[model samples]
Target chain A: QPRTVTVLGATGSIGHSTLDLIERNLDRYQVIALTANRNVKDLADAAKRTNAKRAVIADPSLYNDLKEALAGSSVEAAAGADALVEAAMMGADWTMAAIIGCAGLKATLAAIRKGKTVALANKESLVSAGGLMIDAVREHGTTLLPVDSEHNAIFQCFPHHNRDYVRRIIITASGGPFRTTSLAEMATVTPERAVQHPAKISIDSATMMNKGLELIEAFHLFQIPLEKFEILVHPQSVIHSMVEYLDGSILAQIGSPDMRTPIGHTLAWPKRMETPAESLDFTKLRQMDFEAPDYERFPALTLAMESIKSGGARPAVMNAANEIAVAAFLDKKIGFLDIAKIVEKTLDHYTPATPSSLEDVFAIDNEARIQAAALMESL
Target chain B: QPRTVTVLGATGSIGHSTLDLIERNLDRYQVIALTANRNVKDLADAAKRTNAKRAVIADPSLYNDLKEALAGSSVEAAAGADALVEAAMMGADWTMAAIIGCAGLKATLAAIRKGKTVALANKESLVSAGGLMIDAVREHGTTLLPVDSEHNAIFQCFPHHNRDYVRRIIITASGGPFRTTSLAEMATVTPERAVQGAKISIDSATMMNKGLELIEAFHLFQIPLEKFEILVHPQSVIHSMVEYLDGSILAQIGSPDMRTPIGHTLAWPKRMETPAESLDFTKLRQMDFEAPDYERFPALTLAMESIKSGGARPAVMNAANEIAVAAFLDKKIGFLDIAKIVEKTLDHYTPATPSSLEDVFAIDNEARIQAAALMESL
Candidate 1:
C-alpha cells in the first residue's frame, strides 16, 4: 500500500525537495494534498504534476488564480486558513509541515492533533508554540520527525535506548578551521590560524547567527543540561552533528549539503530511502576541519548562548531582534560586519514576558522588532 | 544472570585486554576456562587472578610445569590438544577463540562446535581453516564476532536490514594522511606525501601488508565490488564507515585503541564503558583520509584480487606470502620477490575450495612448498 502524503508548504525549498522525493518514488507514495502560501502557478503546477486530490493556498485571494492554473486538470483548488486545515485533515499517511514561520503553526498543529507523523520544518512554530505543540503531540501521540539536518543527526545517534550513556551532544556548525578548547588556550590563537581561507560567504553564514538560532531550537528540542550542548564549528558541513557517549564513541550523521537527504530520511522514518544527493567521498574532499565556534568573531553565537542561559523570553527576543537586524544588515545600513552586534544591542534593551501561546510569541516578537528598530535608528 | 566466559589465548595481547575489561566488571561475568601455549607462569598468573575454573597448556610437555605453577590454586591445570578442546567444551556462554597461530585451529573449531558466541582473534585459523571455520559456524548456528579493529568497526556500523542502501563499506587502515580516489589520480602521488613523519613504524606497517591480510579476510567474512574499500586514514580515529543510499555516511568512531573493539565484542547486542578515552576532536586537531597505495604495496592488491577470485586462491596466496615473508626474513629472498613468490605460487596451484580443515592444511602445505621451491629457484 502506498503512503498517503501531504506537503503543507509545497512552494518553498523544503517543499520542492519533498515533492521531488515523492515524485521520484511515485509508486511508494500517493499525493493527497499540496498546500502553498502565495505562489499560485507553482502550487498549481505541483498539484497537477502529482495529481493531488486537493490544493489549498494560504492567500485566499490566490484561489481564483490557482483554479485558473488548474482549469484543465482534475485537481481541486481552495484558499484561506480553513481550506488549509481541511487539506491537513484530509488524512495523509505522512505529512511534511514545511510551511515557513508562524503562519504554519495552526496547520502543523491540525496535522499533529490528527495523530499523524509530521516532518516538522517550520522554525517559528516551535519557537512560538513550543510548549503548546509538544504538549499537543504528546496528548495525541504524534510522531514528530525533525527536518533540520543537525537535529535529524542527533536524533539518529542519540541512543534512545539509554540516554544516560550520552555524555554530551556536540552540535556542529559552519565556521573556520581553528579549535578553541579553553578560554586561556584560545587567547593564544594567532591570526593566521584563526581565519578561514578568507572566503566569500553570505551575511548570516558570515556571522553564523543561523547556527546560534538553531542552538536555541536545540536547547528546546533536547532535554539535557544547558551546559551539555557544545557547538563545534566544522568548516566542512559534512558532519551535521554528533552525539558523544560515555564509551568514547562519537556517532555522527554525515552527508553532502542537500535538503533531500534529510527530507527522505524523514519521509521514510524508521527506515532509509534513496536520494539524488551525491554521496560524500572522503578521498575526494580536500579537508574536513573542525573547530570551536569563535565567540570573538561570531558574537551572534555568544548572544544566543547567553540568551538561552538567561532563559524565558530572551531566546524568543533574540530571534525576533535578529529578524529585524538581519533585514537592516542586508539593506546595507549596519556598520558591524558582525550583524549580531545589532541583535545584542536590541536584546540588552528589551525584556518581555515569556510566550506561552502564538499570541504571546507575536506580542514579544513585535515588541522586540520595534525596540530593535529604535536601537538601529540611534546608529 | 552472569555470563560464563572463556579466553583461549589468555595471555596474548587480545587476551590481556579481554581480561582487563572482564576484571573491570567482574560482577557481569564469571571466568570459566583459560588456555595458553608455552607461557607457563604468565598463564598461571592470569588463571589465578581471574579464578578461572580450569587452565590448559597447548604444549603437553609443559603440563608438569603448569601444575607446579598453579601449586595451591583450585584452578584445574591440564595440557595437550585434548585438554584445550575439553576446556572449550566446558559450556561457557561466550568464548574468545584467541589462541596464537595454526595451533589455535583445533581449539577454535572445538569452541565453534559448541554453538556459543565466539570472538575470533587468531589469524591463522581464519586463514588456513577459513572454509572449515565458516562451515562449522554455520552448521552449529553460532555467533562469530570479529576481533580485528577494522572488521569490528565495520560490524559495528554494518546495517543488517536492507543491504541495498549500503553503497560501500569503507575500512580504514593505519595509512599516511593522503586520500586516493581515482586509481589514475593516485599514480601522480609524490614520495614526500607517502612517507610519514620520518616514522619509526615497524617494517610490516611500513609495507602495510597487515592491512592487505585484513582486506582478504574481510571479504571472506562477506560484503564487494568496490563495495568493501580500504580507506587509509592515518589518524585511525574513524575506524570504519558505512555509506548509505541517502548520501548519509554512518561512521563507527572511537579512540584509537583495541579496548573499544574488544569491549564491543564482549558486550554484543549492547555497549559497555571501556577505559578508552573519548575522542577529543579538539585535541586530535584533524583527521586525514586516503586510498591505499596498491602499487607501492602489491601485496594488498594481491590479497584483494585473491579474495575476489574466491575458493582456494586466497588460502594459497596467504600460505605463499607466509613462506616468501619467512624466506625474506631469513635473508634468502629480496623484498620485491615476496609478492612475486605469492603471485607465482597462486598461478601454479589453482586448486579446489577446501571443505574441511584437512583439505585447507593440504592446500597450505602444497602452496608453501611451491613458494619455497620458487624461493630456491631464486
Candidate 2:
C-alpha cells in the first residue's frame, strides 16, 4: 500500500525540498493533502504536481483562487483556520509539521491528537509549550520525530538500544558568515544578508537565542536536564552532531551542510536511505575549529539559560523579545545594538506568570508580545 | 580447592617458565608430578622448589641421582619410560606437555587418555603423530590447549562465540637474522651460523619452514583448508600473531617474546593469571611489521600445499627431515648444505603413504635418519 503524506507549510523552503525528494520517488508515497498559509497559487500548483486529494489555504479569502487553480485537477480545495486543522487531522498518515512559527501549534496538536507520525520542524512548538505538547504526545501515543538537523543528528548518533548510556548530546554549529565580523560591522547588516545565509545559519553564528530554543527542545524530546545538552561551533559543518556515552565513546553523525539529509532521515525513520548529499571525507578535512561562545556578544544565550532556570513563561518571554528585536532590525526601525536593548527591556518589564496549561502558555506569549511591541514602539 | 598440575619435561625452557609463574601464585596451584628426561638435578631442584609430590625421570639410569637429590625433600622419585607415562596420566588434573621431540609421544598419549587438559608445547606430538593424537583427543574428549606461541596467538584471535566466523588464521614469524643472506651463504652455514642463520634467528626472514609447520598444525586442529592461515612477521616482538575474519578485520595479540605466554595461558585456561612477561614500551619497540613470505623458498613452502593435498605420511616425512637437519647441525656432522641434501634424499627415497597407525610414522622417521646418515658417510 502507498503511504499517505501531508506537508503543512507547503510554500516554505523545507516543503519545497520535501516535495522534490517525494517527486523523485513518487511510487513510494501518495500526497493526501498540502496546506499553505497564503500562497494559494503555489499550494494549488504543488497539489497539482503531487496529485494531492485535498488542498488547504489558511486565509479564507484565498480559497476561491486556490479552488479555481485546482479546478481541472482532482484536488478538493478547503480554506480557513478550522479547515486547516481538519485537513491536518484527516489528510495524511504521515504529517510534516513545518510551519515556521507558533502559528503551527493548533494544527500540530490536531495532527498529534489523531496519532499521526508528526515530522516536527517548528522550534516554536517546543519553546512555547513544551510540557503541554509532551503531555499530548504521551496521551495520544504520537510518534513525533524531529526534522531539525541537530535533533536528527542526535537521533542518528544514539544507537537507540538503551537510552541510559547517553552521557551528553552535542549539537554542532557552522558559525555563520558574520562570525568574524565585529559588532560595529553587524550593525550595518541587513535582512537581505540574514535571509541569504545558509539554512543552518540562524543558529550558527554564536547566537545564544538559537541555542536557548534548542536547549528547551532538547529538554522536551530527550526528557533530559538542560545541563546535559551542549553546543559546539564546528566551522566546516562536516560533523552534524554527536552523542557521548558513559563508556568514553562518542558516536557522531557526519555529512555535508544540507537540511535534506535530516529531512530524509526523519521521513525514513529507523532505516537509512541513500541521499545525494556529499559524504564526509576525513582525509580531505584538514582542520576543525572550536571556541567558547562569547556571552557578552550573545546575551540572548544567558537569557535563554535564565528562562529555563526560572521556569514558567520565561522561555515564552525570551522568545517574544527576540522575535520583536529581530523584526525591529529587519525593519531598520532599530539599530543592530538596539535589537538586544528591546529584548532586555521586555524581559525586565514583564512580570512573569506561572503557566499551568496551554491556555496559560498563550496568555504569557500574548503578554510578552504586547510588552515587546510596546517597547519596540517606544524605540 | 587448589588445582593439580603435572609438568612433563619439567626441566626445559617452557617448564621453567611455568614453574616460575606458579611459584608467584603458589596458593592457587598444587604441584602433583614433575617429569624430566636425563636432567636429574634440574628435575630434583624443580621438584624441591615447587614441593611436587612425585618426580619421574624418563631416563631410568638417572633414578638414583634423582632419588638422592630429593632425599631430604619428602618427594617420591620414580624412573623409566613407563613411569613417565604413568606420571603424565595419574598424578594431575592438568598436564603441561612441554617434553620435546617424538620421545615424549607416549607420555602425551597417556595425558590425553586420562582426559586431562593437555597444555601442548611439543609440536612433534602433532608433526610425528598428527593423526593418532587428533583421534585420541576426539575419542577420549581430552581438551588440548596449544602452548606454542603461534597457536596461542591464533587462539587469542579466534572469537570465543562462533568459530564459523573465522576467515583465516595468520601466524607471525620474526624472519631470522639470515633474512638478507644469500642462498649461497645459507648452503655453507655452520651450526652456530645456522642457529643464527634462519629458523630462530632470522625467523621473520625464512618464512617457508615455519609457515609449513603452521599449516600442518592448522590441519590437525580441523581448520578449513581454504581458510587455514597466513604468516605475518611482527618484528617488535609485541604482536605474536593475528587472525582475520569474514569482515576483513584482524585481531592480534601483542607481547614480549617467550614460550611462557602459551604455558601460562593453558595452565590457568580462560582466566589470565600473571603473564610470564609484559611488553615494556620505554625500550622503544618496533612492534608489528608484516608482508607475505618470498615464494623463492620452495622446499619449506611446498610442505603446506603437500599437506593440503592429503597424504597421511607427508607431514611425518616433513617432520623427519626437520629433525635430521636440526640434529646434523647440532652434532656438527654436516654443514648447512647437507641439511637440504638429507631432506632431498629422504623425500626422493619415500613415496607418499596412507596409514592411520603409528608404524608408517616410525618408518618415515627411520628413512629420514638413514638418509642423513648416508649423506654424512658420503
Candidate 3:
C-alpha cells in the first residue's frame, strides 16, 4: 500500500519541493490533503494533480475561489484555521508542516498529537514554542524530522545510540550578501538591497537571524546542551554541518545547496532516493573557506544565542520581535540596522515566564509583537 | 584476561610502532613472541622490555649473539626460518605480520591457519599470494585487519555488512618526491636522491609501491574490478576513501604518520589512544590533489593491469618489480628503466599456477631470476 501523505503549505517553496518528490514516486504514495494559506489556484491544481481527498485554504475569504477551482475534481474543499487543524488530525501516514510561521503551530501540534511523522519546515513553530512542542512530541510519541538542510545534515552525522560520543555540533552558515559589507554601509542598506539575498533565504540572510533561529531549533531538536553548539561561516555552503566526536573524528555531510536532498532524505529515510539536484563536483570546486562568526557584524545571532541561554520565553519573544522588525524593514518603516536593535530592545523590557502550554506560547508571541511595534514608534 | 600477541619482523619501522603501542597498553596484552631479521641487540632489548616468552632471529649466525644479549632475561631465544614459522604459529590471540617481502608469506599463512586475528603490514604476502591467503582466511575463519594507512582508511569507511552500498574504493598516493619532477630529470635520477625521501618510505615511494598496494588491497578486500582507483594527493593527509551509493564520499584523514592508523585499528571493536600527533587543520593548512598520471608512472599502470588479468601475473609482476627496485638502488640501471625491465620480464614469461603456497614461492623465485638477468643486460 502507498503511504498516505498530506502537505500543509502546498503553495510554498518547501511544499512544492515535497510535492515534486511525492509526484516522482507517486506509485509509492497517496495524497490525503494539501493546504495553502491563500494560493487557491495552486492548491486546487495540486489537489487535481495528486487526486487528493481534501483541499483547504487557511484564508476564509478565498474559500469560494478554491471551491470553484476544484469544481470538476472529487476533492473536498474547506477553509479557515479549524479546517487546517482538522486536515492535520486526519491521521495521514506522513505530514509536511511547511506553513511558514507560528500559524503552523496548532495544526502541527494536532498532527503530532495524532502520533504521525512530521517533516517540519516551519522554523518559527519550533523557535517560538520549542519546549511545548518537544513536550507534546515526547507525550504523544511523535517522530519529528527536520526539513532544513543544516539540521538534516547534523541528523545524518549524529550517532543516535552513541550520543555520549558527541563533543559538539558545528552548524555551517553561508554568511549572506552583506557579509563583506561595511558596518556604515549596512546602516543605510535599503530594503531592496537586503531582500536581494544571494540565495532563497532573504531577510534572515541579511541579518543572519536564520542561523540564530536554527540555533534555537537545534537546541530543542537534538536535546544537546546549549554550550555544545558552534557556528562557522562557510561562504561556499558545501559542507552543511558536522558532528565532532570525543575521539577527534569529525563526520560531516556535504552536498550542493539543494533543499530537495534533505526533502528526499526524510521522505525515504534510512533508504535514499535520487534527486534531480546536481551532485557536488570536486574537480570544479576550487576551495572552501571557514571562519569564526563575527558577533558584531551579525548581532542577530548573538541575540538568539543569548535568548537560548536565558532558558524561558525569551527565545519566543526574540523570534516574534525579529519577525515584526524584518517585516517593518521590508515595508521601509525602519532601517536595516533597526532590525536587530528592535529585537534587542524588545528582549530587554520583556520579563519572560516559563511556558507551560501552547496558549502561553502564543500569549508571549502576541505580547512581544505588541511591544516590538510600540518600540518601533520610538525608533 | 589479557590477550596474547606475537610480532613478526619486530626490528623494522612498523615493528617499533607496534611495540610502542603494546608497551603503552601492557595491561591489555601479554607478549607471546617477537621475531626479527638480524638486529639481535634491538630484538633482545624489546624482548626484555615486553618480557616476551620467546624471541627468534631470522639469520642463524645471529643465534649466539641473541643468546648472549638475553642471558639474564627470562625470554627464550632461537634462530632460522623454522623457528620464525614456529613463533608465527605459536597460537597467540593476535599477530602482527610486519615482516617485509615474500619472506613473510609462509609464516603469515601459518598464523592464518590457526585462525588468529592478524594485523597485516606485509603487503608482499598479499601481492604474491593473494588468492591463497584469502582462501586460507576463509577456510580457517582467520580475522585479517589491514594495518596500512590506505586500506585501514577504506576499512573504516566501508560498511562491512552492507557491501552493496559501497560504489568505489579510492586509494590515495602521496605522489613521491618525483611528483613534479620532469620526465627528463627522472631518467638519470639516482638511488641516493630517491632514498632521501621526505619520510622513511623512500624506496617504495619512488617505485609507486602504493600502486602495488592497490593490487594487494583489491584482492584482499574483494571489491568489484572496476570499482578500485588510485588518486595522487601530495599532502598525504587524506589517507584513502570509499564513495557510497549516494554521491557521498567518506574519507579518513590523519596526520602524515603511521602510528595513528595502526593504533586506531589495532584495538579493533574497541578504541585506544596513541602518542601520534593529532591532525591540525589550522597549522598544516592546505591539501593539494590530482589524478595519477599512468604515462609518467607506468609501474602503477602495469601493476593494476596485472591484478585484473589474474593467474600468476600479479605475483610475477611484484617479484620482478622488487628485483628491479633493488637493482636501481644498487645503481645497476637508470631510474626510468625500472618499469621497462619489469614489463620486459613479465612479457617474456608465460602464466603460471599459484594453486598452493609452494607454487607461489617457485613463481616468485623464477620471476626474480628472470628480472635480474634482464637488469644485467640493461
Candidate 4:
C-alpha cells in the first residue's frame, strides 16, 4: 500500500523539494494534505496536481481565494489555525513539518501526538521549544527524522546500536559569503550583499547564526552534551557532517550542495531511492580543508553556545532576539555587527528560567522579542 | 576461561606486534605455541616470556640450538616442517599465521581445516592459494580474519549484512618509497635503496607487492571485478576504504603502524585498548593525492590481469614475482627487470585447472624455476 502523506508548508523551499520527491515516486505515496501560510496560488496548484484530500491556508482571509482556485476540484479547502491543526491531525502516515518557525510548533506537536513519522524542517520549533517538543515525542512514541542536511548526515553516520562508542558529533559549515571579510568590512556590508547567498539560507549564513541555531537543534536531536558538539568551517560544503567514534574512526557523509539528497535519505531510509542530485566526483574535488570556527568573526556563534550552556529558556530567548536583530539589519535599521550586539544586550537583561511547557516557551519567546525590539530602537 | 592462542613466525615483525598486544592482555589469552624460522635466540626469549606450551624452528639443524636455548624452561622445543604443521594444528582457539612466504601455505591450510579463527598476516598464502584456502574456509566453517591493514580496513567499512549495497572497495597504497621516480631512473635503482624499507616490504616500496595484495584482496573480499581500485596515498595514513551506494565513503585511518589493524580485528565485535597512539590529524597537516602511471608500475597491471584470469594463474604470478623480487635483491637482475621476469614466467607456463594445496605448491615451484631461468637470461 502507498504511504499517506501531508506537506505542511507546501509553498516553501523544503516543501517544494519534498513534493518533487513525492511526485517522482508517485506510485509509492498518496498525498493527503498540503498547507501554506499565504501563497494560495501555489497551494491551490499543488493541491490540484497532487490530488490531495485537503488544503489549508493559515491566513483565514485567503480562504475564499484558495476555495475559488480549487472550486471545481474534488480537493477540500479550509482556513485558519484550527484548519491547520486539523490538517496536521488528518491521519497521514507521514507529515512534513516545514512551516518555517515557532508557528509550526503546535501543528508539529499535533502530528507527533498522532504517533506517526514527522520529517522536521523547521529550525525555530526545535531551537525554541526543544525540551517540550522532545518530551511530547517521547510521550507519543513518534519517529522524528531530521530533514536538515547536517542532521541527516549525522543520522546516517551515527551508530544507533552503539551510542556509547560515540565521542563527538562534528557538523560542517560553508563559512558563507563573508567568511574572509574583515570586521570593519562586515560593518559596511549591506542587506543586498548579505542576502545574496548561494542558496535560500539567507540572513542566517551571513551572520553564521544558522550554524548556531543548528548547534542547538543538534544538541536536542542527538541527545549529546553541548561540549561534545563541534563546528568545522569546510569551504567546499561537500562533506555535510561526521561522527567521530571512540576508536578514532570518523564516518562522514559526502554529497553535492543539494537538499534532495537529505530529503530522499529520510524519504526511503534503510532503502535508497535515486535522486536528481549529482554524485560527488573525487577527482574534480581538489581540496577539502577544515579549521576551527573563529568566534571573534562570528560572535553569534558564541552567543548561541552561551545560551545553550545557560540552560532552560535561554536558547528560546536567544533565537527570538536573533530573529528580530536579523530582520532589523536586513531593513537597514541596524548594522551587520549590531545583530550580535542586540542579542547579547537582550540576553544580559533577561533572567534564566526553565520552561516546563510550550506556553512557557511562547511566553519567554514573546518577552525576548519585546526586549529585542526595544533594544533595536535604542540602537 | 582465557582463549588459547598461537603465533607462527614469532620472531618476525607481524609476530612481535601480535605478541606485544597479547602480552598486554595476558589475562584474556593463554599462549599455546610460538614458531620461528631460525631465530633461535628471539624465539627462546619469546617462548619463555609468554610461557608458550611449544616452540618450533623451521630448520632441523637448529633444533639443538633451540633446545639448548630453552634449557630448563617448560616450553617444548621442536624443529622442521612437520613440527611447524604440528604447531599449527595444536588446536588453539586463535592462530596468527605470520610465516613469510609460500612456506606458510600448508600450515595456514592446516589451521583452517581445524575450523578455528586464523588471523592471516601472510600474503603469499592468500595470493598463491586463494581458491584452495577460501574453499577450505567454506568447507570447514573456519573464520578467516584479515590482518593486513588494507583488507582489515575494508572489513571495518564493509556492511557484511547487506553486501549488495557496497559499490566499491578502494585499497590505498603508500605508493612506496619510489612513488615519484621517473621511468628512466627506475631501471638503475639498487637493492641498497630498496632494502632500506621500514619492515621487509622492499617489494611493496616498488608497488609490485601492492599488486600482489590487490589480488589477495579480490579473492578474500569477493567484491565485483570492476569495483576493486588502487589509489596512491603517499602518506600511508588512510589504511583502506569502502564506498557505499549513497556516495558516502567510510575510510579507516590510523598512524602508519600495523598494531592498530591487528588490535582492531583481534577485538572484533568489541573494542580493546591498544598502546598505539591515536591519529593526530592537525599536526600531520598535508593533503593526500591519487594517480598512477600503469607504464611506470607494470607489476600492478600484471597482477590485475592475473586476478581476472583466475585458475592456476594467480599462484603462477605470485611465485614468479617472489622469485623476481629475490633476484633483484641479489643483484642478479635490474629493478625494471622484475616485472619482465614475472610476465615472461606467466607466459611460459599455463595451468588452466584449479589445484589443491599440494598441486598449488607444485605449480608454484614450476613458476619459480621458470622465473629463475628467465632471470638467468636477463
TM-score of chain A of each: 0.88, 0.91, 0.96, 0.96
Instruction: Kindly report the root-mean-square deviation of model 4 from the true structure over all alpha carbons.
Output: 3.4
What is the per-residue lDDT of model 1 for residues B1-378, given as tens digits with 9 covering 90 to 100? 889999998988889999999989889899999988899988999999888899999899999999999999999999998898899899998999888656677788889999989988876676666767878888999888888776676676667656776878877776533232344453343434334532213224334345444653454345554677777777777877888778878887877677877887898877788888867777766878766787766767777777678788878887787787666556576656767888899889988988777788788889989999987896
Q: Is candidate 2 or candidate 3 better by TM-score?
A: 3
Model 1 bad stretches (over 4 Å): A127-129, A176-202, A345-355, B123-125, B176-221
Cα lDDT tens digits for candidate 4, B34-83: 99998999999999998999999999999999999999999999999999
CAPRI accuracy category, model 2: incorrect
Displacement of the residue A63 alpha carbon in candidate 1, Å:
1.5
lDDT of 2 by residue, B221-316 (tens): 577766654444435342332222212222233354453455335443433334433322224322334444454344455456556655544554
Full ranking by lDDT: 4, 3, 1, 2
For candidate 3, write residues B82-172 as lDDT tens digits. 8989999999989999988777888888998889799999877888898999899999998888888888878766767667766678787
Candidate 2: regions farther than 4 A off? A159-162, A181-208, A282-284, A356-358, A377-379, B1-378
- Return the DockQ of model 2: 0.04
- The better candidate by DockQ, 2 or 4, is 4
Give the number of the best model, judged by TM-score.
4
Candidate 4 per-residue C-alpha lDDT over A131-240 given as tens digits, one digit per residue, 9 for 90 to 100: 88888888988888898989988887787656665677888898878888889999998888889744225878988999999999998888887878888887888778
Assess candidate 3 and give its lDDT: 0.83
Interface RMSD of each: 1.6, 12.3, 3.3, 2.8
Angstrom error at residue B182, model 1: 19
Give the C-alpha miss distance for residue A76 in model 4, angstroms.
Answer: 4.5
What is the TM-score ranking, best to worst?
A: 4, 1, 3, 2
